[PDB]
């Protein structure tokens, strides 16, 4: 198994790491900031220092084109992507696709979702028991973002168990063949759904994008259109959930911060920014490929290598954030790499923040006696190189507020 080199040995992507990766991240930052991880499916490098991570995001030698892993005499005949999602592309196709979908995620559009997000959260809360067992992950944190993405896109509620199963396999330590099969089912499902939508459109996003694609296939191809639906669905199932889970947990394990929020509920948006920093939901950005040799902190990563940008690590770098290990919901937030940086910066950043403050804010308002129903040490985390997220969170809700 892998451990940090230097003065302190901490497990890496195994052992104690899943439970609490933060000491390992700190030892990487201090003593091995540009680290090659000899992982089972092949070596992946990891950058953990804030100044390196933030700049890496705008360094074009750090490419999304997986063909950089091939020698040139092998690249000609290969597709640009395994599936034509914009997150797996460089300009110009990235630029074109992002500009197109960005038109549907304008500031005004996402905000007008607040009354509905609030109904959804309020309905979930009303349905939770006072003292019987609750998994706050499956019953609350998971539900909000998934209902929202289904409504935004126009995804049948009756198919929710099929595509949430597919989506989670793609995001965790599943075997590469399992991921391929899940992606296959998700592509076919969404392809068939789009075919049905042509015949009966609705007013939600997938119909709108299908119409753009119908009108102008060079702006958005059919395959690009399915890939976009796939990406938006997976983001709606596997990200915000862990903002909610990690942020709730931060408050449950920090009484002082929970009390400040109780006394000023308007601290919630500042609190959300602090949760995104303190326990980043996307722990490592999806992989980049070195198109040429790059040098960061005195270490050269050769051309052709796979590279993770360590967001959870960088967001606790004391060179950037004083007392990075302290949870302080009152910080005036700025910077941060939890939503990425540059051209691929999170498309759903406004949506995620809104879902987070609504879900966490309304939860603690409604159930001011919420508590964990197990010891902190008993919490099980998912094994993922992409997310920092609880598997389940046993809680006791307590009485509704009067
Ligand atoms: C707290 C929740 C979220 C976190 C922490 C997060 C994190 C990120 C990060 C770090 C990136 C950049 C990855 C990279 O450059 O390699 C990204 C991109 C992206 N995100 Fe988010 N995300 C969240 C929620 C959402 C939501 C709700 C959506 C729904 C629309 C979404 C959709 C996308 C898309 C489509 C991209 C690709 C953007 C592009 O390639 O231009 N995300 N996200
Ligand atoms: Ca119930
Ligand atoms: Ca219409
Ligand atoms: Ca500094």
From Swiss-Prot:
Residues where heme binds: 346
The listed locations are: Cytoplasm
Indicate whether S-adenosyl-L-methionine appears among the record's keywords.
no
Superkingdom, according to UniProt?
A: Bacteria
A Gene Ontology term for the protein's cellular component: cytoplasm
Reaction(s) catalyzed by this protein? Answer: 5beta-cholestane-3alpha,7alpha,12alpha-triol + 6 reduced [adrenodoxin] + 3 O2 + 5 H(+) = (25R)-3alpha,7alpha,12alpha-trihydroxy-5beta-cholestan-26-oate + 6 oxidized [adrenodoxin] + 4 H2O
What the protein does? Hydroxylates vitamin D(3) into 25-hydroxyvitamin D(3) and 1-alpha,25-dihydroxyvitamin D(3), its physiologically active forms. Also displays 25-hydroxylase activity on vitamin D(2) and 7-dehydrocholesterol. May play a role in the biosynthesis of steroid metabolic intermediates.
User: What is the protein named?
Assistant: Vitamin D(3) 25-hydroxylase
From which source organism is this entry?
Answer: Pseudonocardia autotrophica (Amycolata autotrophica)
């Amino acid at each position: 198994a892998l451990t940090t080199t230097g003065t302190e040995q901490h497990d890496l992507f195994s052992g104690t790491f899943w439970q609490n990766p933060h000491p390992a991240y700190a030892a990487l930052r201090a003593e091995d900031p540009v680290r090659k991880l000899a992982l089972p499916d092949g070596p992946v490098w990891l950058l953990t220092r804030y100044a390196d991570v933030r700049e890496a995001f705008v360094d074009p030698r750090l490419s999304k084109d997986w063909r950089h892993r091939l020698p040139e005499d092998q690249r000609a005949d290969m597709p640009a992507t395994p599936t034509p999602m914009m997150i797996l592309m460089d300009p110009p196709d990235h630029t074109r696709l992002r500009k197109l979908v960005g038109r549907s995620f304008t500031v005004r559009r996402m905000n007008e979702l607040e009354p509905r997000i609030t109904e959804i959260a309020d309905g979930l809360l009303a349905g939770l028991p006072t003292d019987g067992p609750v998994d706050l992950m499956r019953e609350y944190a998971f539900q909000i973002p998934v209902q929202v993405i289904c409504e935004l896109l126009g995804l049948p509620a009756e198919d929710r168990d099929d595509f949430s199963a597919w989506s989670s396999v793609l995001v965790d330590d599943s075997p590469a063949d399992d991921k391929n099969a899940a992606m296959g089912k998700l592509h076919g499902y969404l392809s068939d759904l789009l075919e049905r939508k042509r015949t009966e459109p609705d007013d939600a996003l997938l119909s709108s994008l299908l119409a753009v694609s119908d009108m102008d296939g060079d702006r958005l191809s059919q395959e690009e259109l399915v890939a976009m639906a796939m990406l938006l669905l997976i983001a709606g199932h596997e990200t915000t959930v862990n903002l909610i889970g990690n942020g709730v947990l931060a408050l449950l394990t920090h009484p002082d911060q929970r009390k400040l929020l109780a006394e000023d509920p308007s601290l919630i948006s500042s609190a959300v920014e602090e949760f995104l920093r303190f326990d980043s939901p996307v722990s490592q950005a999806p992989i980049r490929f070195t198109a040429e040799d790059v040098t960061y902190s005195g270490v050269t990563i050769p051309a052709g290598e796979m590279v993770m940008l360590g967001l959870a690590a960088a967001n606790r770098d004391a060179d950037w954030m004083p007392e990075p290990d302290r949870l302080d919901i009152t910080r005036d937030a700025s910077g941060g790499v939890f939503f990425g940086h540059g051209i691929h910066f999170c498309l759903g950043a406004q949506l995620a923040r809104l879902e987070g403050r609504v879900a966490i804010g309304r939860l603690f308002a409604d159930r001011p006696e919420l508590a964990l129903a197990v010891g902190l040490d008993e919490l099980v985390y998912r094994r993922s190189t992409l997310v920092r997220g609880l598997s389940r969170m046993p809680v006791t809700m307590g009485p509704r507020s009067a």
